[PDB]
Each structure stands twice: as C-alpha cells, then as structure tokens.
Amino acid sequence: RLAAETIDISLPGRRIENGGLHPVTRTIDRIESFFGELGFTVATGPEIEDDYHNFDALNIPGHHPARADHDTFWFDATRLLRTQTSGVQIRTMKAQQPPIRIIAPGRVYRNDYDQTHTPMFHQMEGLIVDTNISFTNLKGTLHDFLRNFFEEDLQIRFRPSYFPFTEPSAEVDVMGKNGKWLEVLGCGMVHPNVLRNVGIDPEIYSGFAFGMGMERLTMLRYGVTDLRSFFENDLRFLKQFK
Template sequence: MSTADRIAALRSEGEAAVSSATGTAELEEVRVRFLGRKAELPNLLRDVGKLPPDERGPVGKGANEARKAIEAAVEARRAELEAAELEARLAADVVDVTLPGSPAVPAGHHHVITAVRREIEDVFLGLGFRVAEGPEADLVYYNFDALNFLSNHPTRLEADTFYLADDIVLRTHTSPMQVRAMELQPPPIYIIVPGRTYRRDNDATHTPQFHQVEGLAVDEDVTLGDLQGTLLSFARAIFGDERDVRLRPHFFPFTEPSVEVDVSCFNCTHGFLRDGGRCPLCKGTGWIEILGAGMVDPNVFGYVREHGYDPDRIQGFAFGMGIERIAFLKHRVPDLRMFYENDLRMLEQFG
C-alpha cells in the first residue's frame, strides 16, 4: 500500500473511531491513538522528507489534511459528548428550589414590635374599628394647630420636635390622622391609626423613633363610658381576662375631659408580691399607666364642621398608646432601646 493510500486509510479509520466514541474519556483515547506523538499519522508527516521529491508534496498535503480532519472531528464530537453529559447531569441532579437549604435555615418571624402592633390591630378590628394610616412627615397644621395645641405649647419647640421646614414636622404622634380622616368622611367614624412617630427623646423609656396607635370614635351619643368599655376590652385581650382599667383626670390639648388610663397590675396582688415585697412594676400602687385618652375637644370638631362634625350633634373619644410601651409591659422588657439593638438573643425569644 502506498503512503498516500495509508494516509487515506488512517483518515477514514480515525473519523470512524471518533464518531463511535461514547464518552469524552474514550474520545481522548482515540485522539491519542491517531494524533499522539507515537501515532502513525504524525510519524508519516515527520518522515515526508525521506520520500522521493515528487511524492513529498502530495503526501505532506494529504497527511496535513487527514490530521486537520481528525482534529475537527474530535472537537465536534467532544462538543456533542460534553453537551450530552451536561444534559444527563442536569437531569440527574435536579434541585427543588422550594425545599429548605442544607443545613436548614431557621424560619424568620415578625419583630416583636410588629407582632404587638398586629395584635393590637386585631383587637380593635374585632371591636368594629378599621385601620387607617397617614404620612410620617406632616404639616404643622395637622400635627398641632387642628388638634388645639396653643401656639406656645412646649412640644412645638425644636428642642422637642423634628422640623423638616417651618410648616412641616416629623409627626410627634399619629393623632394628625384624626382631622385628616374626618375631612375624608362624615360621621360615624371608628378608626385606629398605627405608625411610626418621632420626638427628641432617648433614654430607657423613650426613643427618638417609636410607634403609636391612635384611636378615634365619633358618633351620636358616644360617652366616656364607651371609652372605658372599649379600653377594658383591649386591656383584657392584651394582658389577660382578669385585668381591670381605671381612668384618672389629666390634660391633653385635643380632648376634654382628658384621662390617663391605667391597667391593673398583672405582676402582683394589690401592689405586693408573694414574698410581701413591693411590686417593682407598679411601684406598689397596683396599677400601671398604659395610655392617654379622652373625649374629643369640641374645638377639634370646629376644624371639620363643614364635613358634618357639628359638636352640638355628635361626640367622640380618642386615645393614643405607645406600641413599645405595650410590648414593654406585655413581655417585661427592662429597656425600650433593646427593641432596636438587634440582639438576636433577645429578639429570638419572641418568635
């Protein structure tokens, strides 16, 4: 067999072997057998110089074409085999992304403040109130003026309140929604307004940002007794069925009469612990202050009279509580700032 015929035969054998390879490892063996340093085809190329001059050109050209053809066939087959192997691996290693990771990541839960807020909302929704929300940056008009705050009231000072402009503040309470809500609908109205509020305070019982729930009920023949009954239902839902509430006279610019609301202490009996010591939670009084409230001042209705709030025809009550304070009492947290320090040892107790 002539050298040219042998080259043609090697090319045919190599391409056939490549096409029949069933894996990348087998394909590599074929490549080495036909194109490796000791393979016949490369040796023929190296020995071209030993041939008669008239055979060198055709033999060299044929050997190069055979080598390139086998190399191209190897690369094409390798791409086919790698694609098939990848497809097989993907089919065999399907990952269900809906399954938990390994190791499993503990499920998250609401922050204690969010959990208490939702618990408060659920109580008042059950009492027939609806939830409303308002802007955190509000006009001085809604935050102070329309709520009957005198022009020289201390909370208007920059030492107490964050001003964004002369007539815009970060709301100091969620009470601005009283007037905003009454502007949007005529009576009757029964709403609670949860949300963030801001004041220049920072100590064990105050934080610059905190959360409040404002309540407003306006209808005909609403009385202070209705307020007391509503808050009694709230206190028993949050702190236990044995709780009682009492109202003490107080002053707020936007309610008249105004009251502080206390709940009977859930840590002691009449101010004393079982060992006879004075209760540190209620300081021996048997009562714990939880919120401020009162009957809506007629002056506030004066700002929304044209919306159907005639103070000679309707009455209402309002109340405001700090969500942190409710959580503080419910879960016996000693310092409000702990709610915001993001210490997981503390937060994971309330999952």
C-alpha cells in the first residue's frame, strides 16, 4: 500500500478563490490606521444636509462665490448632497468639548463630469483641536504622513492657497516625475469664526485641519492613470489589487 497508493503531488488543491478589496477602500483603511496609531478616532454621519450644516457653519456665509463653484446638487432651498465632509466634524465639535481630535472619511458630490472628474470622489477631512499647536506642528505631521504613505522617494513644497473654512491656508503639492509637481492635499489652521459659533473660545484654543483626495492619492501610488476606471468596476482591473 505504501509504495503503491501514491497520488499526483502538484495538482491544484480545492478551495474558493478569495477576492480583494477596492483600492480607495485599501487607501482609506491604510490612512485610517496611520492616523489611528496617533490617537485619532473616526467619525461618521449623513450624506444629505441642510445649509446650516454644509455652508453656513463653515463661515462661507451665503453671498460668497462658493455656492456655484462647489457645483452642488440642490433639492429645494435647504437640502443638498454633501459637498465636503465637514458636517460630520461640526456635529462632533458642537456636542462635546474641547481638547480631542477626529478624522472622517466619506463621499462628496460635485457636478463635474469629464475624463478627469467623476461626480463622486472620496475625501478625508481631518480635524485637531487642543492648546498651543501651530503651522510648525502642521508641517511636522503632514510631512510625516507623506513620508510614510510614500517610501521617501518624493519632495514636497508648502505653497499658499485659499479655502474659506480655514485661514491661514496652505497646499502641500508633492514632486512628480512625469510633469513637475502634482498637488496632493491642502491644509490650514481653523478660522476663529468657525470656532466661535460652535462653543470653543478662540482666545485660548487653536487647531488645524486637512483634506486630501483619496482617488488621486491612489492613482499616484498604484500607477493608475484613468480616473473614470475606478467606478466602472471591472473585475479584470480590480483583481490585481488583491
């Protein structure tokens, strides 16, 4: 029986072919772990919002030219799909107080369709509020996150920009190799009028915030160049990310 009942040895064994995640899902969870080992805990919320959550709380305030350039999806007059994931942190800053931070992943919507802009793309808005942090402690964390998401291949340059809910502002804009510089993320310290209509005193407190695009980060990381291919969901494209 011993030298007779032998089998074939290298035939493929029986199993079910396991399948992998989505690339923006993997990048969201990777940056979630990267910030979870600093103590940031996530926060979530709804995708539909009135004006007092999305525009009039971030000190826009309504006659500003930020209500057509955001390319919003309106419903009647006090309903819109969420244009930037910040109501999830305003509804957290309002309730409790005042020395803890949070991050938030989620879906935003912008009325733009081309071969370079899907109408939906995931954003990741951080938030941190505690005593005596500044722009030095913004560069020293975003530089660290870029050096850890990449593997120290690329160079950064902090340049100025303008977002209405954070002033003084910035932009981080890592070094590519095909062109000159690709703009990756933007940041800035929280405006005091954002703090004052929430319940935090801006005379003693401070903080910053940052918002990055997950699909441009994932495209630049894993080499993909066609942004519309992320959401047509072909298995022959999605199987290599496993």
